[PDB]
Amino acid sequence: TIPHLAIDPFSLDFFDDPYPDQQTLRDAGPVVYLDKWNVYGVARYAEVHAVLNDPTTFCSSRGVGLSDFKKEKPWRPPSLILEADPPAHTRPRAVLSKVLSPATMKTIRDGFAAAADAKVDELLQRGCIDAIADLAEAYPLSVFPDAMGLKQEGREHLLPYAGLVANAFGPPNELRQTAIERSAPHQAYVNEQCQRPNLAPGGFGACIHAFTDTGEITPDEAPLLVRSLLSAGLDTTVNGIGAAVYCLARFPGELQRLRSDPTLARNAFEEAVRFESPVQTFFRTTTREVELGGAVIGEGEKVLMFLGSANRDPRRWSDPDLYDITRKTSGHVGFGSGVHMCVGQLVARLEGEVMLSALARKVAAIDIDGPVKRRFNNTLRGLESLPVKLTPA
Numbered sequence: 001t002i003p004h005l006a007i008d009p010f011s012l013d014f015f016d017d018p019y020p021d022q023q024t025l026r027d028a029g030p031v032v033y034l035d036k037w038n039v040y041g042v043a044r045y046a047e048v049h050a051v052l053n054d055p056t057t058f059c060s061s062r063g064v065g066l067s068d069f070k071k072e073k074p075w076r077p078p079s080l081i082l083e084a085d086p087p088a089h090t091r092p093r094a095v096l097s098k099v100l101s102p103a104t105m106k107t108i109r110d111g112f113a114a115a116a117d118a119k120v121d122e123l124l125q126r127g128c129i130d131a132i133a134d135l136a137e138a139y140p141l142s143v144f145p146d147a148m149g150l151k152q153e154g155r156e157h158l159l160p161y162a163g164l165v166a167n168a169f170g171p172p173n174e175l176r177q178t179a180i181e182r183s184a185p186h187q188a189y190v191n192e193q194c195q196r197p198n199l200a201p202g203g204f205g206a207c208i209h210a211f212t213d214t215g216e217i218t219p220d221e222a223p224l225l226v227r228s229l230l231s232a233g234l235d236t237t238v239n240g241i242g243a244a245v246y247c248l249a250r251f252p253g254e255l256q257r258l259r260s261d262p263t264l265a266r267n268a269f270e271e272a273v274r275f276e277s278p279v280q281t282f283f284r285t286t287t288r289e290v291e292l293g294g295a296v297i298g299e300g301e302k303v304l305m306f307l308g309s310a311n312r313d314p315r316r317w318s319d320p321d322l323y324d325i326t327r328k329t330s331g332h333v334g335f336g337s338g339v340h341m342c343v344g345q346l347v348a349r350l351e352g353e354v355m356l357s358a359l360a361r362k363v364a365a366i367d368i369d370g371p372v373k374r375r376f377n378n379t380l381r382g383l384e385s386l387p388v389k390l391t392p393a
């Protein structure tokens with residue numbers, strides 16, 4: 001009843017061009033079995049959305065990577081939010097929600113926007129840049145570590161640690177084992193910066209520690225919650241901004257619409273998140289026998305959700321393979337859906353919005369003028385290098 005496929009969604013060939021294989025996965029049926037890794041897969045929007053929104057049946061506390069924490073030891077102490085289920089999830093989630101809240105965004109927006117404008121001004125003086133290193137990486141690194149309250153020294157560990165975390169959700173392939181082999185210095189830096197004395201007053205990390213006296217989290221839970229923001233708070237924003245620049249370079253008609261109405265900047269970034277989905281996949285583990293899309297899945301089975309595929313499912317989206325900055329993006333699953341839906345989404349959207357706004361107001365053309373190189377990661381999609389020429393408006 002369930003089609004079995006040999007597609008390896010964690011292979012370099014798949015990463016290099018995933019979209020034909022994602023169509024094969026969608027069109028094979030609502031639920032597939034991936035023989036390479038002995039997991040179930042769902043690649044259509046309907047089933048991905050259903051799985052995300054049933055956390056009791058499709059839990060997170062046995063890990064959201066391939067590994068089942070009931071069977072194997074986690075490679076680091078589990079996240080108190082990403083790898084927890086309700087009710088344990090609920091109060092740590094509330095703390096991070098308040099730390100990264102709508103009200104917090106007001107306190108950081110002016111500085112984030114000023115830094116985005118300053119970066120584009122700097123880049124226009126150079127003309128020919130690498131939109132990854134010099135823009136997609138450089139801009140988040142110029143605002144988010146400061147907003148965290150991190151010291152200056154050791155920040156070179158942040159992107160490597162995030163890539164390690166992302167690779168470690170994958171299967172035990174070469175990408176994962178090489179990441180773990182190289183992990184020790186990055187883990188040591190990150191774990192140390194999570195301690196309260198190392199986080200500057202008023203920043204995200206200090207605010208997490210300040211919540212330890214409300215009864216929502218204890219003092220010994222705050223370092224792991226800081227760790228969540230150091231794990232998740234940079235690499236997907238980098239990939240999303242790079243994806244947005246890539247899209248504006250490949251679809252010049254959309255850059256022209258953005259220039260003509262810069263208030264489209266927020267939705268142009270949201271559409272980039274749908275179109276390139278920086279987080280491609282997450283797993284759940286079944287806690288009982290369950291019927292999903294006409295399939296019976298036993299207890300204790302891993303279920304791989306294809307978020308990027310769900311965001312390009314023609315059953316849900318009109319012309320899913322077009323980048324359209326006025327698309328109604330509401331409902332895409334690039335940030336997840338339901339109780340675990342990205343708690344940092346307002347930070348990511350703020351950064352993406354103000355960077356695309358600066359581009360919309362200052363740049364007349366973005367032309368690729370060198371070889372584009374892909375960055376390979378078991379769970380993240382994004383570019384390694386994006387040589388562009390920026391023409392000033």
Ligand code: HEM
Pocket residue numbers: 060064081082083093096100228229232233234236237240273277278279282307333334335336337339340341342343344345347348
């Ligand atoms: C474009 C940028 C981003 C993308 C595409 C993205 C994607 C996602 C997705 C798909 C999830 C759902 C995980 C699941 O259902 O198992 C998630 C959760 C989460 N994200 Fe983001 N994320 C981004 C930016 C950020 C930022 C900037 C932060 C922190 C400042 C952050 C922190 C978190 C945390 C802590 C969780 C776990 C939430 C929970 O389990 O309740 N993310 N993200």
Ligand SMILES: COc1ccc(C(=O)O)cc1
Pocket residue numbers: 079080081082083165227228229231232279
């Ligand atoms: C979206 O990716 C991540 C990665 C790590 C964590 C965490 O460490 O809590 C959360 C989300």
